[PDB]
Amino acid sequence: TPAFNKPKVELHVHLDGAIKPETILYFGKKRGIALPADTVEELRNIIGMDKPLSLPGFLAKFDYYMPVIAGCREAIKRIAYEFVEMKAKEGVVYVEVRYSPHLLANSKVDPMPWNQTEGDVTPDDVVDLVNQGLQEGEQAFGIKVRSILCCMRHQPSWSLEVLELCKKYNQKTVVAMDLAGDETIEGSSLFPGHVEAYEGAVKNGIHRTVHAGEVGSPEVVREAVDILKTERVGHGYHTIEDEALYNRLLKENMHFEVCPWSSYLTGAWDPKTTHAVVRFKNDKANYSLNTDDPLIFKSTLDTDYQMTKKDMGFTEEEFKRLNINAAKSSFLPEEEKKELLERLYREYQ
Is 238 annotated to bind a ligand? Reply is no
316: β partners: none
Is 12 annotated to bind a ligand? Reply is yes
Torsion of CA 44, 50, 53, 57, to 10 degrees: 0
**Domain of residue 185, residue span:** 1-349
CA 196, 201, 205 angle in degrees (round to 5)? 160
Is 270 annotated to bind a ligand? Reply is no
Report how far residue 102's alpha carbon sits from residue 204's, in angstroms, rounded to the nearest whole number: 22
Is 194 annotated to bind a ligand? Reply is no
Candidates 96, 161, 183, 214; catalytic one = 214
Resolution in A, one decimal? 2.2
| Residue 251: φ, ψ to 5° | -70, -35
> What single string gives the DSSP state of each residue in 323-346?
HHHHHHHS---HHHHHHHHHHHHH
| Tally of residues, the chain | 349
CATH code assigned at 15: 3.20.20.140
Number of domains in the chain: 1
Report how far residue 83's alpha carbon sits from residue 195's, in angstroms, rounded to the nearest whole number: 31
Catalytic residue at 214? yes
Cα–Cα distances in angstroms (integers) from residue 195 to residues 157, 210, 235, 236, 254, in the given order = 11, 12, 20, 19, 20
Own/partner pairs, 121-126, CB within 8 angstroms, 24+ separation:
121/71, 121/72, 121/73, 121/76, 123/158, 123/161, 123/165, 124/165, 124/168, 125/73, 126/76, 126/101, 126/102
Task: Give the method of determination.
Answer: X-ray
